[PDB]
UniProtKB/TrEMBL annotation, chains A, B, C, D:
Database matches in Pfam families: adh_short_C2 (PF13561)
Annotated SMART domains: PKS_KR (SM00822)
Keyword Oxidoreductase: yes
Residues that bind NADP(+): S15, Q16, I18, R38, K39, D64, L65, N91, G93, Y163, K167, V196, T198, H201
Family: Belongs to the short-chain dehydrogenases/reductases (SDR) family.
Name of the protein in its database record: Carbonyl reductase
Species for this entry: Sphingomonas sp. A1
GO molecular function: nucleotide binding; oxidoreductase activity
Keyword annotations: NADP, Nucleotide-binding, Oxidoreductase
Domain Ketoreductase per the UniProt entry, residue ranges: 7-180
Length: 257, 257, 257, 257
C-alpha cells in the first residue's frame, strides 16, 4: 500500500513472532517502525539493518507493558524518536501461563489481565492524542490495530480461560472506542489469529499439533507471515478508510466469523 | 419450576434491582436464597420475612466482592448457613463510574475490573467444589448463572468502555468453564439484560431514557421482574438440563442475539 | 407456566420428534394444540387422547407446507377449529436430502428452500393477523417461535449446505419481523437445537454419533424432551414478556451462543 | 497486490456501483476482468478501454442470474473468453423491491430469493471446477468472494426482510463451502457493505440519509471505491492465503463485527 511510506508505526510485541513478521512487512512498505519487547532480543540491530535495507526505518524500545508507567514511557520514547504516531499496533500479550479455574489465584489473574488488557487499554490511551494529531494534520485517518484471538470468540483452551476472555474484552472495548473516538480521526480494527506457528504454541508436541490441524479446514497452523498483510491493510487509509470496529480472523477456516 | 423447591441459591448483588426481583421469585419457588450486597438494605429483614411467607427461606450476607478473600468468605458463610450450594448467580456488578478513555487511570481501571470480573471469577472458583458436590449427590446438574449485558455485545456506553468489555469478558469466560467443567456436573449460562429500570439507570433524565427507548422495538425499559424468570429457567435442571454455555438477552428487541 | 392454560398453539411439524415432545408439554400446561405433519402418524388418535387426558386439547392437520396455499389452508383450518391463534411454532422442516454443492440442482434447491424457508415465511404471514388480534384482545403479547439449528450458526454438514443456510435465514428474518411487528403485539424467538435424538439423525451409525458427541461437552445427543421447556418459556408472556428477537441454542455446550 | 497480475476475475453485477468500482481496481492490478450485468450498460466499451489503458483486460457478459441456465452460460462464456477462472466475485443482487411481511406473495418471494441466493449458489457451483483446476495448476489458492450486507447481521430494513435474510443465508452457506471445498484449493470470503452511495440507496431522500448517518460513527455513507480494496485483499493469495470463511464489514462503524 503506497500510502504507508513514511508512516510512523509503533508495534508492541514485535521482538518476535507475529509482531516481528508484521514489522518487517511495514518496513518494506517504507514505514518507520517501533520495535518492542520486554528485553532487547539478540541481534536486534541486525533486524534494524534488514528493515532499513528494505527502505524503511526501525528503532527498538524495551518495556514491560503490564504497568501503565511502562506504556506511557514507550509512547513517549517512540514519539521522541520519530516525532509522532500514525499507527498503533497492540500486539503484545500472551498466555502468561496455564491454570485451571480452581487454580486461579490473584497473582496469576493479575499477571494475565495486566499483560493482555491493561497493556492495550493504557498504551492506546497514551497514543490517542498523537494519533488524533497526525489525523488532523493529514486530513486522513490514523489507525489502531489490536491483536485478538480465535479464543476471543469460542473461549480459551485448558488453563487459558483468562487469556481467551481477555481477548474477548479487547474485541469489545474497541467497539466503545469506535463509538466515541471515530470523531478523533482514528479507526480501530482487530486481527484475530487462529493457531499460528510461533513461540506461543512451541510447547505443543506434533501429536497435539496434528489434532488441532484436523479441526482446521486448511489442515495446518498459520505462519507469522500470513498474519502480517492484514495489519498493513487495516493501517492503510487508502485500503480501509471506511472500515472501523471490525475483527478479522486469520485461521485457515478454523472459526468462521 | 417444581425442582427448585429446597434448592440452595446464592445470588450476589441481590440487595436490590434485578438480583432482588430474582431472589423474590426463587423464594416463591421454595428455594433457600442467599441475599447479598455491599451494605444491608434499610429493610432487609422485611424482605427476608416476605420471602419466608412466600414459601422459601433467605439470609443476608454483606461483602465487597472486589477482593478474592471477600468472595471466599461469602461462599463459606453461605455454605455454613444452608449446608451447600446448588445454584450460584453472579449478579453483583456495576459501572462504578463513567470515565472516557483519556481519563481511565489505574485506580479506576482496577475498580471496574475488580467489581465486574475478579468478583465473578473468584466467587465461581470458590463455589465450584460445592456446586460439583451437590451435582454428584443428586445425579442432576448444578447451575452457575451470570448477569451479562447488551453492552457485552455492542460495547459500553459513554465512559463505560471497561464495563461493557468486562461483560464481554464474562460472556467469553463461561465458554471455557463449560468446556472443562461440564464434567463436574455444572451448567453455565448468562442472562443479559438490555436497558432495565433499576438504580443502574437512575441518573438518566427523561429525554435520555426516551432516546434509548426509540432504539427498543418494545418502546420501553424493561423491569427487574421481567429479568427474573430466565434465571429460574437456567437454574432448573428440568427446564434447561441440556442447555449450557448460552447467553440469553432480555431487552425488548434492542439487540437481537 | 400458568398463563398457557387455554392458549391456542399451532405447532407445525408436531407429528413426531421435537414438535411432538413440545406439543405434549403444551397440553400438560392446558393448551389447545394444533398437531401437524405431512402425514397422520399411525397412532395420532392415541396421541390426541393422551394430550386430552393431560388437561389440554389437540387436533391434527395434514399439510405439506412447501406451498403457500397449504400454509394458508393450515392456518384457516386451525382458526376454524380453535377460534384463533395465540402461539405459532414454526417447527416443520428438515434436510430433504444430502447433496454436495456440485450436485445441487434447481429441483433439489427448490425442495430444501421451500420446505425450510417458504414454509416459515408464509405460515407466519398468514398467522400474523390472528396473532395480532389475540394480542389486542388480551393486552398481552402473542408469540411466534421458530426452530433454528446449530447449523444456522456454524454451517450445514455434508450435503446439508442449503439446510444450514436456510436455518441462518430464519435466524435473520426474525430480526426484521421484530423490528416491524413488535407494534402488532407479537414476540418472535427461536429455539436452536444442536444434535437431538430424533428421526432427523436416524441415519447416523453409532460411530458417527459418538464422534459428534466428542465435540459436545455434555458428551451426548439431546432428547426431544430437553427441547420442549424452552418453547413453553418463549410462549409464556409471564416468563418472557420482554424477550424478543433472540435465538436460544440447546446443545449441551456444542456451540456457545 | 503483485500476484493479481494476469488473474482471471469474474465479477457478477459489475455493470455499475460496487461491482464496477471493484472491477476498475482489479484492472489497475493487471487482472483480466469479466464485467457483468442483466443488460450491457451504455458506454460499456469505454469502460473496457479505461480498464485496458490501466494495464488490465475486460469483456462484458449479459446474464440474468435468477436462473441456473444463465449462471452456467455466464461461466461458460467467461471461460471461453479468458481460458479459466482464478477469482469469482458474487456481487450481483439487490432488494428487488420492498414488501412488508403481510404483502409477501410467491412471485416477490421467488424474485428476491432467486436474485440473491440462487444466483450465488449456482454461479459458485458452475465456477467451482474451474477455480479448483486453476488452484491445482498454480499450487496456490483460487478465491470466491461474495457480497454480503450489514442486513445479514442485524436484519433487513422496511420491506426488506427477505433481502437481509438472503444475505444471512450467504454468510452461512460459505461456512459449509469452506468446510468441504477448502480441499479443492478454493478460499471463500465475504465483503459486507453497510450503507453505500450507489443506485441501491438512490431512492433515499436527504432527510433519510441524514438520520442513517447519525447511527454511523463516521457520519456518512460509504463510497463504492471504499469497498473495492477489500475484494482485492481477499482475492490475493499473498495477502490472505490463510484467510477463509470470514465476513468483513465495511460500514464506518455502523455495525461492529
Ligand atoms: N500464536 C497464535 O496462535 C496466536 C493466536 C491468537 C492470538 N495471538 C496473539 O498474538 C500476539 C503475538 O503473539 P505471538 O504468537 O507472536 O507469540 P510471541 O512470539 O510469544 O510474541 C509475543 C510478543 O509479545 C511480547 N510481550 C509479551 N508479554 C509482554 C509484556 N508483558 N510486555 C511487553 N511485551 C510483552 C513479547 O515480548 P518478549 O520477546 O519480551 O517476550 C513478544 O514480542 C499476542 O497478543 C498473542 O496473544 C497468537
Ligand atoms: N439495569 C440494567 O439496565 C442492566 C443492564 C445490563 C446489565 N446489568 C447488570 O445487572 C446486574 C444488577 O444490577 P442492577 O441493574 O440490578 O443495578 P443495582 O440496583 O445497582 O444492583 C447491583 C447489585 O450489585 C451489588 N454490587 C455492586 N458492586 C458490588 C461489589 N463491588 N461487591 C459486591 N456487590 C456489589 C450492589 O450492592 P450495593 O447496592 O450494596 O452496592 C447491588 O446489590 C449488574 O451486574 C449490572 O451490571 C444491568
Ligand atoms: N434433530 C436435530 O438434531 C435437529 C437439530 C437442529 C434443528 N432441527 C430442526 O428441528 C425441527 C424438527 O425436526 P426433528 O428433529 O423433530 O425431526 P423430525 O422427526 O423429522 O420432525 C420433522 C417434522 O417436520 C415435518 N415436516 C417436514 N417437512 C415438511 C413439509 N414439507 N411440510 C410440512 N411438514 C414437514 C415432519 O412431518 P412428516 O413426518 O409428516 O414428514 C415432522 O413432523 C426441524 O425444523 C429440524 O430442521 C433438528
Ligand atoms: N449499496 C449498499 O449500501 C449495499 C449494502 C449491502 C449490500 N449491498 C450489495 O452490494 C451488491 C452490489 O449492489 P450496489 O450497491 O453496487 O447496487 P447496484 O449499483 O444496483 O449494483 C447491483 C448490480 O447487480 C446486478 N444485478 C442485479 N440483479 C441481477 C440479476 N438478477 N442478475 C444479474 N445481475 C443482477 C446489477 O446489474 P444491472 O445493471 O443489469 O441492474 C448491478 O450490476 C448487491 O449484492 C447488494 O445486495 C449493497
Amino acid at each position: 500500500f503506497p500510502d504507508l511510506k513514511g508512516k510512523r508505526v509503533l508495534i508492541t510485541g514485535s521482538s518476535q513472532g507475529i509482531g516481528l513478521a508484521t514489522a518487517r512487512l511495514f518496513a518494506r512498505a517504507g514505514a518507520k517502525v517501533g520495535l518492542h519487547g520486554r528485553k532487547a532480543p539478540a541481534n536486534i540491530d541486525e533486524t534494524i539493518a534488514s528493515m532499513r535495507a528494505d527502505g524503511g526505518d526501525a528503532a527498538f524500545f524495551a518495556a514491560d507493558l503490564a504497568t501503565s508507567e511502562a506504556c506511557q514511557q514507550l509512547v513517549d520514547e517512540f514519539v521522541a524518536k520519530f516525532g509522532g504516531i500514525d499507527v498503533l499496533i497492540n500486539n503484545a500479550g500472551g498466555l502468561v501461563g496455564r491454570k485451571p479455574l480452581p487454580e486461579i489465584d490473584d497473582t496469576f489473574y493479575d499477571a494475565v489481565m495486566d499483560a493482555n488488557i491493561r497493556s492495550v487499554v493504557m498504551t492506546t490511551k497514551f497514543a490517542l492524542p498523537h494519533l488524533a494529531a497526525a489525523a488532523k494534520a493529514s486530513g486522513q485517518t490514523s489507525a489502531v490495530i489490536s491483536t485478538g484471538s480465535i479464543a476471543g470468540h469460542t473461549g480459551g483452551g485448558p488453563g487459558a480461560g483468562l487469556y481467551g476472555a481477555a481477548k474477548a474484552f479487547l474485541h469489545n472495548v474497541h467497539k466503545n472506542w469506535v463509538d466515541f473516538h471515530t470523531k478523533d480521526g482514528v479507526r480501530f480494527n482487530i486481527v484475530s489469529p487462529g493457531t499460528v506457528d510461533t513461540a506461543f504454541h512451541a510447547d505443543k508436541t506434533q501429536d497435539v499439533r496434528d489434532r488441532i490441524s484436523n479441526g482446521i479446514p486448511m489442515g495446518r497452523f498459520g505462519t507469522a507471515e500470513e498474519m502480517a498483510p492484514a495489519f498493513l491493510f487495516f493501517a492503510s487509509h487508502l485500503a480501509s478508510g471506511y472500515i472501523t470496529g471490525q475483527v478479522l480472523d486469520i485461521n485457515g477456516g478454523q472459526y468462521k466469523h
